[PDB]
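Slack export, channel: ligand-projects

TW: morning all. Re-posting the request from yesterday since it got buried. We need the structure predicted with the small molecule present, not the apo form. The ligand is copper (II) ion; the SMILES is in the block with the sequence. No rush, but it would help planning for next week.
GE: picking it up
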Amino acid sequence: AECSVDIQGNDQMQFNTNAITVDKSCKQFTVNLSHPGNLPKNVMGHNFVLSTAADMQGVVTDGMASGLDKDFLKPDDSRVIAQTKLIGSGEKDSVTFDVSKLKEGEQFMFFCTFPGHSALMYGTLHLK
Ligand SMILES: [Cu+2]
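GE: finished. pasting the full token output, ligand included:
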């Protein structure tokens, strides 16, 4: 029942962690993103986006082209397993998704799609 993680993106373009692990029993997993720090959504917005590792470049490249107004995510992108909204300083957003959308045999990556960020802002998610 610890079926969450709190994760932070800061003004230094880093997530607080590079690895999330999801337990054995969770019907659902929740990611509670916050942005400590001072920069607004246009300078240093962060979202938390989850996909297969192979799907990550697509989601990031298409997201950029989709623009700020769309939280830098292609709308109705079936590659996205979970997303939060894009957030800036002092904001928060949480996403819950079904653990079953985690296809056994896959490797998963989380990342921010704000332009440039995913060079630093990425990590792995493993089903445990
Ligand atoms: Cu970011």
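GE: first-pass observations. Residues 9, 45-46, 112, 114, 117, 121 surround copper (II) ion (CB under 6 Å). The two ends are 14 Å apart (CA to CA).
TW: perfect, thank you
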